[PDB]
C-alpha cells in the first residue's frame, strides 16, 4: 500500500535468528543519542539499530551463568550509556557496556521474575518484578533504594505488572497486564493514580504491555489483546489512538519514545519493530 496511509513511518525485521531478524521480540528501548534497542527473549540477544532502522550491532550469549542471557525481557539505556537487561528466567538484571560487554548483574536472590526495566532521572534502575507483583528501585551498584507494590487487586497492588516508564517529575508508570490498568507512583513509591478498565472501547484495555511517557506527561500504552496503541494524558484520561490500521499490530509488547519524538513498538506477532509518527 501507499506510504503514509496510517501513522507508520517504517518497519524493520522478519522471523529468524540471524542479524536483523527476530523470534520473540519483547523489550524495546530508545536512547537519547539516536539508537533503538530490541531484546529478543527466544533468540536470547539484544540488537542495536539507528533511529532510522539501520542495523548497528548484536550481542548476547545464551545460558544461565552470569554474563549470559536465558530469557531477556526488558531493556533500558542508562544515561551512562550502559545497557540494562532484565532476565525473567535467570531472575536478575544484567548491566552491559554500550559495546555489549557484561559488567555486573543486580537483584540476584531478591527478584523472582523480572520483566520491564526503566531508568529514572537520577540514574536509578526501575525493575518490574512480574512474578512477585512488585517494583524495585536499584542503584546501578546493586543497592536497593526502594521497593513498592504487592500482589492484589487494589490501588497499591498488581495482578501481573509488565512494563515501566518514568516522567519528567520522576513519577513511575506501571502497566498491570491482568488488572487491565496502568498505575502511577511517585519516586518514593507512594500511589498517585490508576486508570484503565477491561474492554474494547476508548481508554479500555485487554492486557496492557509496553509503556512510554512524553514531555507533556502523556502516557502511550500498547494493548496486547486488542493489538493497538492508545495515548492518555498524565491523569489517565484518553486522548487518541495511534493509527495502525494499514499494517495492523499483532500482540504488541515493549514500546518506547525515540530521541526524535516517534513511537517504536515490538510488533511481536509480526516479527518486527514498527516506528510511528506521534504528535501532541
Distance CA 255, CA 274 (A): 10
Q: Is 28 exposed, middle or buried (0-12, 13-18, 19+ CB in 10 A)?
A: buried
Q: To which CATH superfamily is domain 8-276 assigned?
A: TolB, C-terminal domain (2.120.10.30)
Strand 197-198 to 191-195 pairing: unpaired
* Distant-in-sequence, close-in-space partners of 2: CB < 8 Å, separation ≥ 6: none
For 178, the grid coordinates are 491482568
Give rounded-to-5 percent helix, strand, coil for the chain.
0, 50, 50
- Method of determination? X-ray
- What are the CA-CA distances from residue 6 to residues 22, 72, 221, 225, 270 (Å)? 24, 31, 18, 21, 17
Residue located via cell numbers 504491555: 209
For 88, the grid coordinates are 525473567
Beta carbons of 249 and 275 less than 8 angstroms apart: no
Domain residues of the chain, as ranges? Answer: 8-276
Smallest CA-to-CA distance from 21 within 31, 30, 29, 11 is with 11
Strand 125-129 to 114-119 pairing: antiparallel
Distance CA 27, CA 74 (A): 4
* Distant-in-sequence, close-in-space partners of 222: CB < 8 Å, separation ≥ 6: 208, 209, 210, 211, 228, 229, 249, 252, 253, 254, 255, 265
Amino acid at each position: 500500500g501507499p506510504m503514509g496511509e496510517d501513522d507508520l513511518i517504517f518497519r524493520v525485521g522478519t522471523k529468524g535468528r540471524n542479524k536483523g531478524e527476530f523470534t520473540n521480540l519483547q523489550g524495546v528501548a530508545a536512547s537519547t543519542n539516536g539508537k533503538i534497542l530490541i531484546a529478543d527473549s527466544n533468540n536470547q540477544c539484544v540488537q542495536i539499530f539507528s533511529n532510522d532502522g539501520q542495523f548497528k550491532s548484536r550481542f548476547g550469549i545464551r545460558g544461565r551463568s552470569p554474563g549470559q542471557l536465558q530469557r531477556p525481557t526488558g531493556v533500558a539505556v542508562h544515561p551512562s550509556g550502559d545497557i540494562i537487561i532484565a532476565d525473567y528466567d535467570n531472575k536478575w538484571v544484567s548491566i552491559f557496556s554500550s559495546d555489549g560487554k557484561f559488567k555486573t548483574k543486580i537483584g540476584s536472590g531478591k527478584l523472582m521474575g523480572p520483566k520491564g526495566v526503566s531508568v529514572d532521572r537520577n540514574g536509578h534502575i526501575i525493575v518490574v518484578d512480574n512474578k512477585a507483583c512488585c517494583v524495585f528501585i536499584f542503584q546501578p551498584n546493586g543497592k536497593i533504594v526502594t521497593r513498592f507494590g504487592s500482589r492484589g487487586n487494589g490501588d497499591r497492588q498488581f495482578a501481573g505488572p509488565h512494563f515501566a516508564a518514568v516522567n519528567s517529575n520522576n513519577e513511575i508508570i506501571i502497566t498491570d497486564f491482568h488488572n487491565h490498568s496502568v498505575k502511577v507512583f511517585n519516586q518514593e513509591g507512594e500511589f498517585m493514580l490508576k486508570f484503565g478498565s477491561n474492554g474494547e472501547g476508548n481508554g479500555q484495555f485487554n492486557a496492557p504491555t509496553g509503556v512510554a511517557v512524553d514531555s507533556n506527561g502523556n502516557i502511550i500504552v500498547a494493548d496486547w489483546g486488542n493489538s493497538r496503541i492508545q495515548v492518555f494524558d498524565g491523569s489517565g484520561s484518553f486522548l487518541s489512538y495511534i493509527n495502525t490500521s494499514a499494517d495492523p499490530l499483532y500482540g504488541p509488547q515493549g514500546l518506547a519514545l525515540t530521541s526524535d519524538g516517534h513511537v517504536v513498538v515490538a510488533d511481536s506477532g509480526n516479527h518486527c519493530f514498527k516506528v510511528y509518527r506521534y504528535l501532541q
